[PDB]
Design an enzyme around this catalytic site. Structure first.
Site, PDB file in Angstrom:
ATOM      1  N   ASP A 151       6.591   2.192   8.057  1.00 31.09           N
ATOM      2  CA  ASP A 151       7.631   1.277   8.479  1.00 31.09           C
ATOM      3  C   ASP A 151       6.891   0.028   8.966  1.00 31.09           C
ATOM      4  OD1 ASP A 151      10.347   0.355   9.420  1.00 31.09           O
ATOM      5  OD2 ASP A 151       9.349   0.575  11.371  1.00 31.09           O
ATOM      6  N   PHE A 152       7.524  -1.145   8.915  1.00 29.62           N
ATOM      7  CA  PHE A 152       6.813  -2.350   9.340  1.00 29.62           C
ATOM      8  C   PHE A 152       7.010  -2.660  10.825  1.00 29.62           C
ATOM      9  CE2 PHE A 152       6.573  -6.966  10.024  1.00 29.62           C
ATOM     10  CZ  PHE A 152       5.246  -7.175   9.670  1.00 29.62           C
ATOM     11  N   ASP A 153       8.232  -3.038  11.199  1.00 31.51           N
ATOM     12  CA  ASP A 153       8.537  -3.416  12.581  1.00 31.51           C
ATOM     13  C   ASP A 153       8.540  -2.224  13.532  1.00 31.51           C
ATOM     14  OD1 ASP A 153       8.911  -6.269  12.282  1.00 31.51           O
ATOM     15  OD2 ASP A 153      10.745  -5.781  11.163  1.00 31.51           O
ATOM     16  N   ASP A 330       8.883   4.277  13.599  1.00 34.19           N
ATOM     17  CA  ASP A 330       9.016   3.890  14.999  1.00 34.19           C
ATOM     18  C   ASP A 330      10.392   4.238  15.576  1.00 34.19           C
ATOM     19  OD1 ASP A 330      10.379   1.379  13.642  1.00 34.19           O
ATOM     20  OD2 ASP A 330      10.628   1.103  15.809  1.00 34.19           O
TER      21      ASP A 330
HETATM   22 MG   LIG Z   1      10.955  -0.316  12.990  1.00 28.66          MG
END
Ligand SMILES: [Mg+2]
Length: 386
Positions: A151-153, A330
């Site tokens: 995942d990025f963020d 996250d």
């Molecule tokens: Mg995220």
């Protein structure tokens, strides 16, 4: 309540998503259903006849409507739970008002509460072994050859309140570079395909943007959800509509992405919140779109079923080899991907300080986004080992 074991039934209380269940008092929720919720760490409470109204009953449990389930046999309960943004509203049809209850705002309707399921098997994030420590045990983390998903963020990039200010955490670029020479990599994001690609800034890997509705392969082949793509002009029209409707009211922002309209109302006065909402629900009706709520945003998305697990499974199907997935996430959307990594896959959750010890399907934990860069480096080094 029927127990579903690390799976999702028709109607499911999901501890990962649901911190409490608010029962309508007239319902006779057995001691067996409350005890079921007690073992998985989910609070209960009652609202209703002359008693608390759903939002009030939720306040006594210190639980936001977005994390709470309401179960109601009456219309007033269903509706009030609907205008209060409750995450799951189960209507209980005991007088054959299934149509009425669903018109009120019931997400789903049952005849009897034994049709309701509770998800078991997830552990709380606290309880999980560390990914770095597991990676360095005698047998390593994965036995079979992997493909790694990010995942990025919140995972690769440290959380920020300015979306445009999200950047790769220190060391994560060199780390992804090493790992990419060693196995297939895929970064997932709800941002547009172009945004996430620019921000990672690393080629020869897979980028999945716009919630998996469009991706780029390493060779630069574009792939897009066909059915979802049909709603692209639809959304540009809703955005055009919403800008004229809500233009007069300051503090309200219409943000258009390729597969979605988001209406930000952080700076909007009381009583345009209902007005911001009313307009998006008009845009909804008019265009057959899908509304979902952020904390201070309402979003319109294509009305097409999809999640991060389907991205993962799709990307995997296109990888050469039986490639085992390692997945790092996250938040809540990443739970869909934890659930489909398979018997040898490794689901890892990135912990934050304000995350509150959610139940999760992930098997391991990384303590912060800083350790994600460390995990990535050592993984690339352990794969170069073999
Ligand atoms: Mg995220």
């Amino acid at each position: 309540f029927e127990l579903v074991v690390r799976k999702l039934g028709p109607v499911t209380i999901d501890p990962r998503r649901h911190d409490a269940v608010l029962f309508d008092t007239t319902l006779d929720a057995t001691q067996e259903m409350v005890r079921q919720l007690q073992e998985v760490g989910v609070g209960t409470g009652v609202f209703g006849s002359g008693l608390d109204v759903p939002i009030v009953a939720a306040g006594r449990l210190a639980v936001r409507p977005g994390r709470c389930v309401v179960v109601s046999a009456h219309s007033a309960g269903v509706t009030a739970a609907r205008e209060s943004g409750f995450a799951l509203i189960i209507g209980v049809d005991r007088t054959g008002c299934r149509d009425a209850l669903r018109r009120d705002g019931a997400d789903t309707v049952v005849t009897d509460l034994s049709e309701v399921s509770v998800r078991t098997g997830d552990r709380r994030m606290s309880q999980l072994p560390d990914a770095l420590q597991a990676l360095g045990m005698a047998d390593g983390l994965v036995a079979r050859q992997p493909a790694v998903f990010f995942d990025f963020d919140g995972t690769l990039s440290d959380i920020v309140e300015d979306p445009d200010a999200a950047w790769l955490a220190p060391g994560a670029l060199e780390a992804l570079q090493k790992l990419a020479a060693r196995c297939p990599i895929a970064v997932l994001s709800g941002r547009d395909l172009a945004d996430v690609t620019q921000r990672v800034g690393l080629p020869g890997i897979w980028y999945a943007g716009s919630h998996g509705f469009e991706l780029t392969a390493p060779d630069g082949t574009h792939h897009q959800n066909d059915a979802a793509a049909a709603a692209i002009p639809v959304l540009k029209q809703a955005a055009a509509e919403l800008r004229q409707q809500l233009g007069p009211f300051p503090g309200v922002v219409v943000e258009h992405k390729r597969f979605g309209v988001a209406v930000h109302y952080r700076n909007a006065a009381r009583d345009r919140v209902g007005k911001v909402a009313a307009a998006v629900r008009t845009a909804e009706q008019r265009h057959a779109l899908r509304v979902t709520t952020g904390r201070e945003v309402i979003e319109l998305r294509p009305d097409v079923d999809w999640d991060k697990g389907k991205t993962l499974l799709w990307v995997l199907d296109h990888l050469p080899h039986p490639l085992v997935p390692i997945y790092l996430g996250d938040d809540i959307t990443d739970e869909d991907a934890f659930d489909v990594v398979g018997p040898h896959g490794v689901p890892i959750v990135v912990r934050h300080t304000d995350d509150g010890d959610r139940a999760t399907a992930a098997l391991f934990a990384l303590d912060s986004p800083a350790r994600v860069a460390e995990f990535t480096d050592r993984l690339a080094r352990q794969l170069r080992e073999a």
